[PDB]
Structure formats: C-alpha cells, structure tokens
Amino acid sequence: IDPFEMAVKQLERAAQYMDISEEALEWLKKPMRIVEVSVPIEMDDGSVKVFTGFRVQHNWARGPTKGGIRWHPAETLSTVKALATWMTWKVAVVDLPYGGGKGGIIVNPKELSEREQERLARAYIRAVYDVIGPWTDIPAPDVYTNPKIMGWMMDEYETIMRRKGPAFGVITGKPLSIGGSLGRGTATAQGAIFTIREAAKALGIDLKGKKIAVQGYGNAGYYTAKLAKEQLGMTVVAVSDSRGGIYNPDGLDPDEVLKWKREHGSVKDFPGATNITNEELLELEVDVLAPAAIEEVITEKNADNIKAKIVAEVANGPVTPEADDILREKGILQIPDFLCNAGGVTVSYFEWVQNINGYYWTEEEVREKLDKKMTKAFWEVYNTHKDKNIHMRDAAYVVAVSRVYQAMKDRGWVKK
Numbered sequence: 001i002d003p004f005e006m007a008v009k010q011l012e013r014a015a016q017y018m019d020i021s022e023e024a025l026e027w028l029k030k031p032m033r034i035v036e037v038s039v040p041i042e043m044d045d046g047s048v049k050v051f052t053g054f055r056v057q058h059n060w061a062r063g064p065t066k067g068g069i070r071w072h073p074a075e076t077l078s079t080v081k082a083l084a085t086w087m088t089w090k091v092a093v094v095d096l097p098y099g100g101g102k103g104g105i106i107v108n109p110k111e112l113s114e115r116e117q118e119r120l121a122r123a124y125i126r127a128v129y130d131v132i133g134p135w136t137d138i139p140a141p142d143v144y145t146n147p148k149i150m151g152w153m154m155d156e157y158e159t160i161m162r163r164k165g166p167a168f169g170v171i172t173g174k175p176l177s178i179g180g181s182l183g184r185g186t187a188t189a190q191g192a193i194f195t196i197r198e199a200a201k202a203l204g205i206d207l208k209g210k211k212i213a214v215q216g217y218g219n220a221g222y223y224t225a226k227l228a229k230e231q232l233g234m235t236v237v238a239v240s241d242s243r244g245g246i247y248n249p250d251g252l253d254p255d256e257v258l259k260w261k262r263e264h265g266s267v268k269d270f271p272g273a274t275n276i277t278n279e280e281l282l283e284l285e286v287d288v289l290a291p292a293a294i295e296e297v298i299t300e301k302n303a304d305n306i307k308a309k310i311v312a313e314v315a316n317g318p319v320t321p322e323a324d325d326i327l328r329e330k331g332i333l334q335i336p337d338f339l340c341n342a343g344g345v346t347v348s349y350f351e352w353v354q355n356i357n358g359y360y361w362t363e364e365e366v367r368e369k370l371d372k373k374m375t376k377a378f379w380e381v382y383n384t385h386k387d388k389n390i391h392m393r394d395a396a397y398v399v400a401v402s403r404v405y406q407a408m409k410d411r412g413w414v415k416k
C-alpha cells in the first residue's frame, strides 16, 4: 500500500476524534509545496549522471519547515510526502516553531565514492536552493546521510548565499567544528529516557532497580539502554540486535555488550547471558520495553503476549493499530512513536537556535532544555489521553493537529 495514502488515512482517523473544519482537513491532506529537481553530477569516469531529488514542504503555518534528506535507491515522491506529513505532527507535538518538510534523492550511496557523494550533495543544494533557507526550510541528516554530507551541503549553501546571513542555520546535524551542536549523538535516546521517566511518574512506578529490554542495538538502542541504566538506575536484562539477542536477569552492562558487538560483530553468545531471539525477547516480564529497531514488530500475533508495563516506541511505528488496541485493552501504557523519538528533532531545533543566535550552549544546557520540552510534551499528550478517553497515539495526533490547525486559523488561511 502507498505511504501517502496511509498518512492521509491516519490524519482522517485523528480528525475523527477532534473538532476540525472540512476545509482545514482538505488543506492538511495536501503538501503546500512539492519540488522535484534533477541533480546532475559528473562521475569519476567523467560521465555525467542525473539523479532525481525531492523537497516536500507539507505545511509552514507554525514556522519554517524541518526534515531530513534520504539517500535511498527505493525513494519515491510518495515516501517523501508521507514523511514530511509525519514531520509536521512530530514538530507540532513537541511544540517547536516549525513546519513539516522532507527531502530525498533516488540514489544508491553505496556505489558512490566520497568525491561523487560531495558532488551529489552540492548539486542537490544548487538545485533546491530556491526553496530552502534558515527561515524557509532546514534540512537534516536522515537514512544514508550523515554530518559529513550536512557540512558539504551547508558549505555549498553558504557559497551560493554569499554569506549574507546565518548560513550555518540552513541545515542541522552539522559537525561540531562548523555550527554543530552538543548532545546530537544521544538526542533520541535522551528524549526517550525522559519520556519513560515521565510515564513511570504518571503510572506511579519507581524505576530504581526495575527491568528494561531493548530491541535493536544501534545508536538509538544502545544509548537508550546506557542512559536508562545510568540516569534511571534500571536493570538492563535483555538487549537484542540484528542477529540475535541475550538475556540476564541480574543485569547486563551496555558498554561491555557494545564492546562484544564491536569485537565479534554481534551481541550473540555474550558471556554470562542466554542467547534468545527477538520474538521471545519482546515478551519478557520487564517494567518497560523499548523497541528501537525495524518497524512493525508488535502485531496481533504477539500483542497479547507483551508483559511490559510501558512500551516506548523509540523506533518509527513499531506497533500496528491492532496491537495498539490490544495493548491498551491490557492497561499497558504506550508512548507514541513520534512522541518518544522526538528528541532528535528537538536537538536539531536547538542547533538551529544556536546557529541563528551565533551563541552556542553546553551539554548541560541542551540536556535541561530537552528535559523541559520532552516532559511538557508528554504531559500534554497524557492529559489529552485522560480527558478524551482515547488512545495515546490518537491523543498525540489530536495535540499536533490542533496546534497546526490553530496556527492555520491565526494566519487566516482557513476561515472556519
């Protein structure tokens, strides 16, 4: 099934639970500007190859649009549009002065050399310069793009811009040497930890000494486990990856597991732990569960088998709506996917603020501001959850769409 249709259906289901005019819904069902450009680069053999680049700006009622750039061979305009629509609600739920945006290039970056990658980044900037800017559209790292590409892109934008303004703020996720921000490596995990702490506070559970299980041991999963163990004082008992998983009731040390992963290539056969698979790992009796891996892991097949009191969807939509209803029926508290992992876009917003102001913060200041933003967003969503007696995901959609609708009404875009 197409992704943009999925996003529009999600938006309509959200609008079912809130009072929104028909014209506003029709406005929100369409991206406000879609730009498709040709991105020509000259390769190492001397030939010129043309790639397809996208830049979708779904809505900018609340402010300049925000969103990453994907370099995937399976990129489509539908995927970019759906992700921009998703980014609108993501930045709206955590109360940022941002709209929704998304870019992408249909390219296999594995077959490109470093020089070709730099040429691709610079050519993409030259192609989409007319629709981006510090106050118009702020790109960011995404799938198969990294801070190196972000720095190349910022340099090209500054060259075109003739240094007439804050060219550092045109793009986020930059290296620290050029307008980069601290706390950009642990943003998602720190936001997830703050949301988990707030959820435990709401449920009355003290996390000191409790159990956590994490699926997926990449950046997000590893940092989530590490921050949970240190800040929340919890007992990490299970941490699986792409290959297999391990279990130890007394507690695992995420640093040692990461070292083992680096050495042997996986978290399999970890000493002192029992090797298990992802599916049973999802069903251990643990206080909180943090799926930080491939989407759609909790379905109707295993929804009733979840024994976790809190499920923090660190990954992008790892739970299906049927599993959502089943989990809610069990009383299991769910943190919606675009609320749990909203720390990354919040820290990107902080980086943009630092670049715009010309003044840069420390790690402690970024951490405290992230704490404030995530706590306030979670409490807003939870209060909507209780007041409307609807699902947590539905409450997050209600909050985001209500904010965007209010901004649209204030500008006079929609009269009703």
Ligand SMILES: N[C@@H](CCC(=O)O)C(=O)O
Binding pocket: 066, 067, 068, 139, 140, 141, 142, 143, 172, 344, 345, 348
């Ligand atoms: N959330 C997307 C892009 C949003 C952003 O970082 O600005 C990501 O995982 O990078």
